Ligand binder design. Structure first.
Ligand SMILES: [Cl-]
Ligand SMILES: [Cl-]
Ligand SMILES: [Cl-]
Ligand SMILES: [Co+2]
Length: 492
């Protein structure tokens, strides 16, 4: 965009004033954000910078969210003391920092190195977000003066609508508070105890659905107002191959929230749920992890085409314990079947944010990732999500009885907190297939850069099962430790 050029220019300017160990601003370049790599100040003397620094990554990621959240975005110069303008510098690795910020904030800003008085500095260019970006502490604030204060979704959106890109699902409609069904509102309340203390009006407005004139946005209308049509429906089969045993189609006068619930409800029943025994300790386990299902559901309900008529077609196969979710629309010109687990930009950012506001979905990648994890963790195969001729996007979850050996293999992970960890899940999975694993394979697996790969591998190298690490190094590759191999030999 033309904004970027303006921003890069401003930075060049600030840097050109370099003299006497510090830099200065001017009315034109007053908004540039001067930041100093945190965790290096000792008072009298400042420590040398390293290529990696998680503490600094945290603070910086939080700052990027301020920026991206304020309209027009802005630029940051890491390595310049705030207010004074004294050059400090930073040796943070670009790729590391980019990937690091992206992992905790959900955005990968353009960062470029620069050299002032011989010192190195990072120029970070962050663009305006199409939806609020919550920081590491789940806060939503934007740049004001040189500092940045917090803002509610209500204000954030009216401003986004006004001076920002076009979010179709955020546009104003003719729907008013009187169009919101009490049933839908009731649902929102039983799903988030926070709203409990406020009225229907201040609720819808709190989540950014309700205008200031009293109008609902397109995402607000779609969620709390009947869309006089089926949004999603279920068809229970006996076996992948036809012969419909039964179908549950929600009434068109229901809002998406109502329709979503109606499907979830009936789905909870179809998901039979059988009993597994471990050391005579018997526990009820559904054919497919509840989370995995609801995750797949909300996912379609949020990234659906919504402009198409045909409802999200969700079918359940009895004898195979598998659930298929076909959604109208296809991967946007950019995303591919092998570039989804990394994608973060939703079709309808406005709609996505509204679901977040209601507390019905996680940041984003967390969703699909927790889904994958939940599958792998029970020894099932990862949920496959490919594009079907239509356009259509179907997600397939194949479940059934859990595989005991795998359960215990995971049950024996240490630290305990690493059991439900997505990284060790992917890593262990790649090794369930391949004999050896390389940093490249781990990468293509997580569908992420080489940084995430190194990270996952490391965490797995430090994980322990039966007093031995998960993976072990040999030659120039990595491979499952005999500890696990012995547990997995008892499969089939
Ligand atoms: Cl369920
Ligand atoms: Cl949108
Ligand atoms: Cl919204
Ligand atoms: Co600053």
């Amino acid at each position: 965009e033309g904004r970027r050029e303006q921003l890069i220019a401003q930075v060049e300017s600030i840097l050109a004033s370099a003299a006497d160990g510090r830099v200065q601003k001017t009315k034109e370049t007053q908004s540039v954000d001067f930041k100093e790599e945190a965790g290096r100040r000792n008072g009298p003397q400042i420590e040398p910078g390293k290529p990696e620094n998680p503490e600094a990554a945290d603070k910086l990621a939080d700052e990027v969210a301020c920026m991206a959240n304020t309209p027009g975005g802005g630029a940051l110069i890491v390595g310049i003391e705030d207010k004074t303008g004294r050059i400090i510098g930073t040796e943070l690795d670009i790729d590391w920092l980019r990937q690091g910020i992206f992992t905790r904030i959900d955005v990968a800003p353009d960062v470029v190195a620069k050299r002032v008085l011989g010192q190195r500095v990072l120029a970070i260019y962050v663009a305006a977000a199409a939806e609020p970006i919550e920081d590491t502490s789940d806060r939503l604030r934007w740049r004001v003066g040189d500092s940045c204060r917090p803002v509610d979704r209500a204000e954030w959106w009216e401003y986004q609508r006004a001076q920002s890109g076009f979010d179709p699902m955020a546009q104003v409609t003719t729907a008013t508070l009187g169009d919101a069904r009490p049933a839908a509102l009731a649902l929102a309340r039983k799903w988030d105890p926070a709203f409990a203390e406020l009225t229907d009006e201040e609720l819808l407005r709190g989540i950014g659905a309700l205008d200031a004139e009293g109008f609902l946005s397109q995402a607000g209308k779609l969620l709390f107002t009947s869309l006089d049509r089926t949004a999603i429906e279920l068809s229970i089969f006996d076996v992948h191959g036809g012969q419909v045993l039964n179908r549950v189609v929600p009434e068109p006068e229901k809002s998406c929230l109502e329709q979503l619930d109606y499907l979830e409800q009936a789905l909870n029943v179809v998901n039979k749920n059988n009993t597994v025994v471990e050391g005579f300790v018997h526990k009820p386990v559904p054919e497919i992890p509840r989370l995995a299902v609801r995750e797949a559901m909300l996912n379609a309900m949020i990234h659906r085409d919504w402009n198409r008529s045909e409802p999200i077609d969700v079918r359940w196969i009895e004898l195979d314990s598998t659930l298929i979710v076909r959604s109208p629309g296809g991967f946007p010109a950019a995303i591919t079947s092998e570039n989804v687990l990394s994608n973060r930009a939703a079709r309808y950012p406005a709609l996505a944010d509204l679901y977040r506001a209601l507390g019905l979905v996680d940041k984003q990648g967390v969703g699909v990732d927790r889904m994958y994890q939940a599958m792998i963790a029970l020894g099932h195969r990862p949920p496959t999500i490919e594009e079907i001729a239509g356009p259509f996007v179907e997600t397939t979850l194949v479940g059934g009885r859990p595989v005991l050996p795998v359960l215990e293999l995971v049950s024996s992970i240490v630290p305990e907190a690493r059991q439900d960890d997505y990284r060790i899940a992917i890593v262990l999975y790649l090794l369930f297939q391949r004999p050896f694993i390389t940093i490249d394979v781990v990468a293509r697996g997580l569908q992420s850069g080489k940084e995430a790969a190194r990270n996952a591998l490391e965490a797995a190298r430090q994980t322990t099962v039966a007093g031995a690490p998960l993976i072990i190094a040999h030659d120039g590759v990595w491979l499952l430790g005999n500890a696990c191999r012995e547990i997995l030999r008892k499969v089939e």
